[PDB]
Design a protein around this ligand. Structure first.
Ligand SMILES: [Mg+2]
Ligand SMILES: [Zn+2]
Ligand SMILES: [Zn+2]
Ligand SMILES: [Zn+2]
Lengths: 515, 429, 417
RNA sequence: GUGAGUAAAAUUUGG
RNA sequence: AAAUCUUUCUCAC
């Protein structure tokens, strides 16, 4: 039915592909493709463009965003049991904590300074050395990336070492800064819609618009290209270490370590890869491998193709195409006058993943659709009513609600089917605030997060250091006694104010309440 | 009792960020296993019971949105709805009142959200989320006429005062002007002087509303300092003087420039609730502040230094009118008091910015080619590019003076794309 | 405020007390000595004199308020401050030389830079690839899509019945008869019965894929919503017959038979055999007590079943209907049939898309969007984007791909663009 | 249902 | 048996 749409439609209404198959096959295919490219047979991974014009950032102070170095996402931690290397899957926070414990460094900034200020590779930093760190940082673990619409065969993603992430954060931050300073229109941090709106204005001056994707983008970005880009912007020894680790990377497939001399393992350096092209020309509006440009004559098209080839951006002959009545980037399509193309476009459906969370996500999706010209408001209201009815059909069971309050949604035993406009205008029972896209977290969302905090890879016995002074910076150092004292003082204050836990705060509702 | 040693081995002290990263329990990921997790052990059922018993009664009630305006279908554009964060004093007070420290800490950061919108109002009003089609505005209907006229770019009924036209200051207005080294804030009843030492805004009465507005504009932290004093102070004279009122809407801070590094504020008007910059509005705004110094009222995509360098490079080869336009743009995009050489006359031109064949700058999502501006394109002559020689279905004929868009020209029997048309950027000459 | 001086600040305080016991100097780098609800204006704060103190190096100003007292650390011998008492404190406390490390820059060249560069040089390097020849041509015509569909048909063929897709239509049995038939079908297949639930046991695997053929389209699918809801519900409650308003299913966990001690309960990875009922008429007919019904099975892993069960059929159909052209009547094999076709087969195609956990139709949809929006494409390469049979395996994905291609052909025929 | 170990224990699955 | 290297783990309490 996506084929019989009057307007543009990507068929995103259903979820993406998924399966339980192991990621060994996909990782092997990716590594084989990278190896084949290294031989100089299929594609080109040798960068011949000129990057001598990029500004030098070697004099900038070395700073690290600590928040970007801690997350609940997975990563690979390398240990040595009996002289054999073991790669373990651990939360990135746990991996970085283990790295800091091994190096006996208070913070990652201290660790990077110590790494950059050791007289030799063999000098010991705590319980390790720069040589051992470089050896361990080249190990990766494979996993599957499912739920990617339009990819029936799931791709392989890779988990890296905390040291690799620590250096990658610095190099990527500096690459993003250089892009902001050099690109004709900065788009690294912009959304797909903003990129499309800017690209329309940029390409309005020419007849033909080339909408381009590259093929096997990560497998054709070599360590030499990364080192060239990092030297052009003055990354010093950090870039050298990162390139050395990239060249010697090894992927753990099932139970065997496989060498991957070529490639960069599925977007490890998006900003650097983009800079590899943006640093040689300003005729492309691009990020990652998604780019848009414009031309008037076949000679300009040949020049564009030569520029793409010289930058190791191998055009995807399957997907790239030329147009004259529309432009498209990041799955967003506009007419040449900057108007959104009629049709559903990239609008995606909402699956049943919880009584209230599904309604909240549907409300957000419909708000986005109606704010643009995708859908009239009455159609969105009808769709929201239908979604409420289906949620009632799916969730109004004793397994979920065991309640009958009138103000509750019909899917929780109530008799209330909220109007879309009423919900969006806050003209509803307080229970419906969480269903509002801008409202608080839904009950389903909170319970799921609390349960996820208790998994084997994330559970911990450490006492949470909550309810902190809004003034104390988070970069300050504390010990066990310090946290004990802080908690005791806060509890004493709360008890003196006749409370045992801090009052809940919602800033949006707080602002709305103010006269 | 001893888990600190196990979690952090060989270290006696760790950062707050690392310690708090180990106990994250407020992150939700939508996964295929949601239904099974919610069903297991009636987790969601028990959570709903607890929420209805204990959490729901404590939820405060809030009012509903009522203000509406007539909207029309329009070209897709990015709407920037800046939400200010809690101030330091308010955050400290709330924390002292026993509120959750983590949430209040998260609330101090001003947050900017850009959303696509395809509806426009007669006054370029901003809209609530999901209600652009119905025209629910972030603003509320004003009571008196002066409030309505202050925000209006073209007030309907002038009152003989600066708020709604050329004139002097009323009692409900105030101004902030930079005199020498000191910021003079005059309401009309109280006069104050402020200065920035390192990152604070030293003043006698930081609670002064004009002082708060100045601190927001300068991006500093209010701080009490009775030692601040000034010698030259022509605040009464300018207060009793009359200044021309620009035909521009309020900047994001809710003020309107009236002199070099001088801004007018209204007591009962807060942050701007209407779109400050637009295709039809950008160049008038730039011209309004060509000689008023940096404003900081426009967001530029990318490095401000690079944008200023490109502006200077275009300024080198421009004409007096184009030069004034470029200077106005530079003033518009430059933050106030952040050591930026926005004066294109005194800015050192670099030759590395002259090698590119086009100078592009993006202001509030609007991409402008400075070389084309120098050639008098956006203001004098429109740009035309032929898309095809065939008639496309569903496209209107070419008007006499076309605005930006795609039209069928029957004289040339071709589809044309008009861009940089004065009919869009300079509608009223 | 810079962490470099934090240690220095800690030395400066050194348990100095005022007012007979109370600490004199409060360090701004300490989470317990800091005064709550007070912005910091220096490295430390003297309570007795109520003044902030900041430490600076000779000729290196720091961003602090002017009123803050500065204790300049001279390069060679002494420490000089505006206040004499602070100078004396610096002299007495800094008995040793706590030299502070300098600011490290990103472009800092380490001692091992040359060695690592040599090592990287000695490692393998890529070789230049061939410059590809790009030829731009018109997008593929209807003939190419027809050829792809014909190739699929010839290669794989068609089944005699619709298999599990037939479950989208009601079977002529009531709830009790449906439960009876499903239970007796489970019994006839030697499914183990335990704890009031059915289990399918396996010992060896042929380790080769099952036969793949295209599923003919049933007339309609009025029970798509119930079917998807029941598929969602069953895997979480497998082993028992689950009913709905008009249909029933049975999800049987598939666990290895390991002798006397065998897996008694499924974990997060046990696969499920979903068994459903449809009108009889094929090789899968089952008879019991005069009740006749076709019994069809589907082997799913937990992720596939979760993906299939969470799709919303009604909302998807309405969203598609919002901006949809007239749907032509199609035959049992996806061909245009104006005289004897049915328009309700599109609901069946949508149900097949929902059932296809591979979602191969999304790739066809994206490529068709590109095709519609394209003026020129690469020669012989854009067309190959419609050849996706090598990326999928199974009857359901194969049929989904075939009918997506059929829909593309039908659109190109009925409503040429 | 509560924890500990296995190149893993479902927030799995990274940038 | 099927959407076929998948349908999968131990210990203390
Ligand atoms: Mg891409
Ligand atoms: Zn007035
Ligand atoms: Zn004054
Ligand atoms: Zn059959």
């Amino acid at each position: 039915m996506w084929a019989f749409q009057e307007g543009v439609c990507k068929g995103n209404l259903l979820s993406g592909p998924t399966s339980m198959k192991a990621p060994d096959s996909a990782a092997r295919e990716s590594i084989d493709r990278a190896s084949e490219i290294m031989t100089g047979k299929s594609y080109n991974a040798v960068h011949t463009g000129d990057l001598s014009k990029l500004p030098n950032q070697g004099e900038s102070p070395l700073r690290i965003v600590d928040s970007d170095l801690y997350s609940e996402r997975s990563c690979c931690w390398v240990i040595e049991k009996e002289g054999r290397v073991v790669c373990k899957s651990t939360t990135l926070t746990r991996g970085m904590t283990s790295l800091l414990n091994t190096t006996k460094c208070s913070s990652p900034s201290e660790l990077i300074c110590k790494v950059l200020t050791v007289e030799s590779l063999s000098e010991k930093i705590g319980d390790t050395s720069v040589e051992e760190l470089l050896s361990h940082g080249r190990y990766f673990k494979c996993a599957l990336r499912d739920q990617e619409r339009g990819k029936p065969k799931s791709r392989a993603i890779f988990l890296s070492h905390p040291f690799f992430r620590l250096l990658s954060s610095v190099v990527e931050t500096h690459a993003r800064s250089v892009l902001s300073k050099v690109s004709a229109v900065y788009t690294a941090t912009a959304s797909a819609e903003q990129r499309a709106m800017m690209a329309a204005q940029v390409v309005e001056s020419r007849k033909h618009v080339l909408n381009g994707d590259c093929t096997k983008y990560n497998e054709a970005i070599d360590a030499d290209t990364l080192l060239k880009v990092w030297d052009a912007i003055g990354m010093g020894s950090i870039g050298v270490m990162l390139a050395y680790m990239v060249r010697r990377k090894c992927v753990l497939i099932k139970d065997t370590l496989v060498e991957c001399p070529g490639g960069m393992l599925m977007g490890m350096f998006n900003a650097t890869a983009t800079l590899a092209l943006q640093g040689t020309t300003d005729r492309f509006l691009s990020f990652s491998d998604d780019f848009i440009t414009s031309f008037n004559s076949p000679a300009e098209l040949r020049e564009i193709e030569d520029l793409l080839f010289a930058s190791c951006h191998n055009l995807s002959l399957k997907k790239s195409y030329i147009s004259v009545a529309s432009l498209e980037i990041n799955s967003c399509t506009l007419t040449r006058d900057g108007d959104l193309a009629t049709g559903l476009g990239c609008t995606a459906g909402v699956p049943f993943r919880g009584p209230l969370v599904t309604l909240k996500q549907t409300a957000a999706m419909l708000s986005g659709a109606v704010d643009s010209g995708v859908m009239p408001f009455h159609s969105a209201e009808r769709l929201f009513q239908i979604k409420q009815q289906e949620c009632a059909y799916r969730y109004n069971n004793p397994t979920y609600t065991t309640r009958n309050e009138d103000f509750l949604p019909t899917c929780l035993g109530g008799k209330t089917v909220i109007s879309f406009q009423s919900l969006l205008t806050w003209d509803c029972h307080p229970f419906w605030y969480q269903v509002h896209p801008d409202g608080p977290d839904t009950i389903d969302q909170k319970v799921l997060s609390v349960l996820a905090s208790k998994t084997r890879r994330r559970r911990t016995r450490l006492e949470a250091l909550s309810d902190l002074d809004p003034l104390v910076p988070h970069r300050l150092l504390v010990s066990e006694s310090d946290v004990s004292k802080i908690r005791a003082a806060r509890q004493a204050h709360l008890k003196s104010l006749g409370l045992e836990q801090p009052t809940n705060f919602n800033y949006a509702i707080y602002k709305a309440v103010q006269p | 009792m001893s888990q600190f040693g196990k979690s952090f081995k060989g270290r006696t002290e760790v950062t707050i960020t690392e310690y708090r990263s180990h106990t994250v329990k407020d992150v939700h990921r939508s996964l295929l296993t949601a239904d099974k997790s919610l069903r297991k052990s009636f987790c969601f059922r028990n959570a709903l019971n607890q929420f209805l018993d204990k959490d729901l009664p404590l939820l405060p009630i809030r009012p509903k949105l009522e203000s509406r305006v007539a909207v029309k279908k329009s070209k897709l554009r990015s709407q920037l709805s800046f939400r200010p964060g809690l101030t330091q004093e308010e955050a400290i007070d709330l924390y002292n009142k026993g509120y959750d420290g983590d949430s209040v800490s998260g609330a101090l950061q001003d947050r900017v959200v850009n959303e696509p919108v395809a509806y426009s109002s007669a006054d370029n009003d901003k809209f609530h989320r999901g209600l652009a089609a119905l025209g629910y505005t972030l603003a509320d209907r004003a009571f008196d006429t002066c409030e309505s006229g202050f925000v209006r770019a073209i007030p309907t009924t002038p009152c003989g005062f600066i708020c709604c036209g050329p004139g002097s200051f009323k009692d409900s207005l105030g101004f902030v002007i930079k005199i020498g080294e000191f910021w003079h804030m005059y309401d009309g009843f109280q006069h104050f002087v402020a200065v920035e030492d390192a990152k604070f805004l030293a003043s006698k009465s930081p609670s002064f509303w004009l002082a708060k507005r100045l601190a927001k504009r300068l991006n500093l932290v209010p701080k009490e300092d009775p030692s601040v004093a000034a010698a030259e102070c022509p605040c009464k004279k300018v207060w009793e003087a009359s200044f021309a009122r620009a035909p521009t809407a309020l900047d994001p801070f809710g003020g309107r420039a009236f002199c070099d590094q001088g801004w007018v504020y209204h007591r009962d008007v807060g942050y701007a609730t209407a779109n400050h910059i637009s295709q039809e509005t950008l160049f008038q705004q730039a011209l309004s502040v060509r000689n008023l110094g940096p404003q900081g009222s426009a967001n530029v995509s990318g490095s401000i230094h690079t944008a200023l360098d490109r502006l200077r490079a275009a300024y080198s080869r421009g004409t007096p009118a184009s030069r004034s336009i470029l200077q106005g743009l530079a003033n518009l995009i430059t933050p106030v008091g952040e050591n930026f050489e926005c004066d294109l006359d005194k800015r050192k031109l670099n030759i590395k910015a002259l090698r590119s064949p086009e100078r592009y700058i993006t202001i509030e999502g609007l991409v402008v080619n400075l070389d084309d501006v120098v050639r008098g394109f956006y203001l004098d002559k429109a740009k035309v590019t032929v898309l095809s020689r065939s008639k496309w279905m569903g496209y209107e004929d070419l008007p006499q003076k076309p605005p930006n868009g795609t039209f069928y020209c029957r004289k040339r029997k071709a589809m044309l794309l008009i861009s940089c048309s004065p009919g869009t950027y300079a509608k009223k000459r | 405020m810079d962490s470099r001086f934090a240690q220095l600040t800690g030395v400066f305080c050194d348990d100095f007390t005022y007012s007979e016991g109370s600490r004199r100097f409060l360090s701004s780098y300490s989470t317990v000595e800091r005064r709550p609800g007070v912005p910091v204006e220096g490295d430390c704060y003297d309570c007795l004199k109520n003044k902030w103190i900041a430490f600076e190096l000779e000729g290196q100003p720091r961003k602090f308020p002017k009123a803050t007292v500065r204790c300049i650390l001279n390069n060679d011998a002494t420490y000089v401050c505006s206040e004499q008492e602070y100078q004396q404190i610096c002299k007495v406390q800094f008995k040793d030389y706590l030299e502070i490390d300098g600011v490290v820059k990103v472009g800092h060249k380490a001692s091992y830079d040359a060695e690592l560069r040599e090592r990287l040089l000695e490692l393998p390097h890529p070789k230049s690839g061939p410059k590809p020849r790009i030829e731009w041509v018109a997008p593929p015509r209807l003939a190419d899509i027809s050829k792809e569909t014909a190739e699929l048909k010839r290669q794989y063929g068609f089944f005699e019945c619709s298999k599990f897709l037939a479950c989208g239509e009601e079977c002529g049995l009531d709830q009790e008869a449906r439960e009876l038939i499903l239970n007796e079908y489970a019994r006839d297949r030697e499914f183990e019965f335990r704890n009031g639930g059915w289990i399918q046991r396996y010992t060896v695997a042929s380790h080769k894929p099952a036969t793949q053929k295209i599923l003919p389209l049933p007339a309609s699918a009025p029970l798509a919503r119930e079917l998807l809801m029941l598929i969602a519900r069953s895997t979480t409650q497998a082993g028992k017959v689950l009913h709905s308003d008009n249909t029933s299913i049975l999800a049987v966990p598939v666990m290895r038979d390991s002798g006397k001690h065998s897996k008694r309960r499924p974990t997060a990875s046990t696969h499920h055999l979903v068994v459903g009922l449809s009108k009889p008429g094929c090789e899968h007919d089952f008879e019991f007590d005069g009740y006749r019904a076709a019994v069809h099975v589907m082997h799913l892993d937990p992720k596939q079943s979760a993906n299939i069960g969470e799709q919303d059929f009604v909302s998807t159909r309405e969203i598609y209907k919002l901006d949809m052209l007239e749907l032509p009547p199609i035959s049992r094999k996806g061909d245009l049939d104006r005289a004897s076709g049915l328009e309700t087969r599109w609901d069946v195609i949508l149900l097949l898309e929902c059932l296809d956990s591979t979602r191969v139709s999304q790739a066809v949809a994206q490529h068709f969007n590109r095709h519609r929006l394209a003026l020129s494409v690469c020669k012989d390469e854009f067309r190959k984007g419609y050849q996706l049979a090598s990326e999928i395996r199974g009857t359901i994905p194969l049929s989904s791909l075939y009918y997506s291609l059929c829909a593309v052909r039908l659109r190109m025929t009925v409503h040429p663009f």
